[PDB]
Structure 1
């Protein structure tokens, strides 16, 4: 069967036909810090006020291509992400499906990371069977994983969300947390809807804050400075 031909004939995308540990999730849930969150206009906000340095950063700038205040790759590239990343740390950058696949890699290198994975969010259209440079219909988004310093697969498959829904699949959190990278976890451009135990969420649309830098740092003070987030407290 040629599913590319089939898509041309019927409008059903090939990924429509793709078919088809708990104790570890429990340890992560036990080690998770309380959810912490902060409303901040990241364009006008000195992110050095976000302390301590993070083990994981999830970066979800609102790209214009998500809609059909947006952030351009010019804006994003000028974020001072290296000033808040721990010397050994990870980044997960949502890059969209256009020029971000290139400019997001420039960003990673600018901030001192090398890319170790390319996680693809593949969108099915089981329920409803155009950039001018595009050659093909774009049916997926990329989240690039970068590392700095010294069970899951690189694919997320869900149905394409309704128009104007810009949320990314919550599964990305599962992948990140299963890596056991440490407990200082920052989500930049998160929303009220993405707030989550184990994460500090910072973004312009948050309606409430509870972030206090000293309280936050007290979660990782000795003897807890080096936990992976996957072990007993």
Structure 2
């Protein structure tokens, strides 16, 4: 069966027909290891990034692209590229960068290289439209039904796919599954989410964004969660007695 012809025939995206779309000790170990959620309201354009310490093992970066507002402050790749991400990234660390589906797939790679990372994975968020069987970008050749989250590394169980139904128009949330994929990597405990929201706050993570309504961040308190004997934990091991 040719699901592209079928999409052309009926408006159902090919991904609608993927079916099916224990690691339980992990997740629990993660949950025991997670620092208390920390969060801080900050206008990141106007905010000295270096003020965020210590250096992060993982950076999830979710800047609000104009394309996320089809029928609705947008950040350009010009703006994003100017962020000093290398200044707060640990010598060995990881970045997860949401790039959309347009020019971001190229400009995002430029950012990763600019900040010092090499891409080692391209995670695709494939959106099903089972509940509503698209106004295209001018340069678009096809209907766009996915978003890419690029994984970069710097220094020395899961699939590279996330399948969910397309969120309602103007819902910019990204699938919470991205967090599961990151946590299951066991990359370390200092985890930063730039351009998060009240809705994305989460144990194990420090969230910085302009729309957060409350803050609780304190550098020294944050730092205390990683002082010895806890400096190098993966996030996937037991707490040290």
Q: For this structure pair, what is the TM-score category when the shorter chain's length is used for normalisation?
A: over 0.9
Q: Which residue of 1 aligns with 2:110?
A: 106
Offset, 1:16? 0.2
Q: Distance in 1 between matches of 2:196 and 2:89?
A: 17
Offset, 1:7? 0.1
Q: Distance in 1 between matches of 2:16 and 2:231?
A: 44
Deviation by residue 1:121-180 (Cα, 9 ceiling, x = unmatched): 000000000100000000000000000000000000000000000000000000000000
Q: Secondary structure at the match of 1:104?
A: helix
Q: Distance in 1 between matches of 2:46 and 2:26?
A: 39
Deviation by residue 1:184-210 (Cα, 9 ceiling, x = unmatched): 000000000000000000000000000
Q: Secondary structure at the match of 2:212?
A: coil
Q: Distance in 2 between matches of 1:116 and 1:77?
A: 20
Q: Which residue of 2 aligns with 1:203?
A: 209
Structure 2 matches for 1:171-190, cutoff 5 A?
171-190=177-196
TM-score after normalising by structure 2: 0.97
Offset, 1:231? 0.2
Q: Distance in 1 between matches of 2:153 and 2:116?
A: 8
Q: Distance in 2 between matches of 1:107 and 1:72?
A: 12
Q: Secondary structure at the match of 2:199?
A: helix
Q: Distance in 2 between matches of 1:9 and 1:226?
A: 54
Q: Distance in 2 between matches of 1:4 and 1:232?
A: 48
Deviation by residue 1:84-106 (Cα, 9 ceiling, x = unmatched): 00000000000000000000000
Q: Distance in 2 between matches of 1:150 and 1:95?
A: 25
Deviation by residue 1:27-52 (Cα, 9 ceiling, x = unmatched): 00000000000000000000100000
Q: Distance in 1 between matches of 2:49 and 2:140?
A: 35
Question: Which 4+ stretches in 1 moved above 4 angstroms?
Answer: none
Q: Which residue of 1 aligns with 2:68?
A: 66
Deviation by residue 1:46-81 (Cα, 9 ceiling, x = unmatched): 010000000000000000000010000000000000
Structure 2: which 5+ residue stretches go unaligned? none
TM-score after normalising by structure 1: 1.00
Q: Distance in 2 between matches of 1:119 and 1:202?
A: 23
Structure 1: which 5+ residue stretches go unaligned? none
Q: Secondary structure at the match of 1:71?
A: coil
Q: Distance in 1 between matches of 2:138 and 2:216?
A: 43
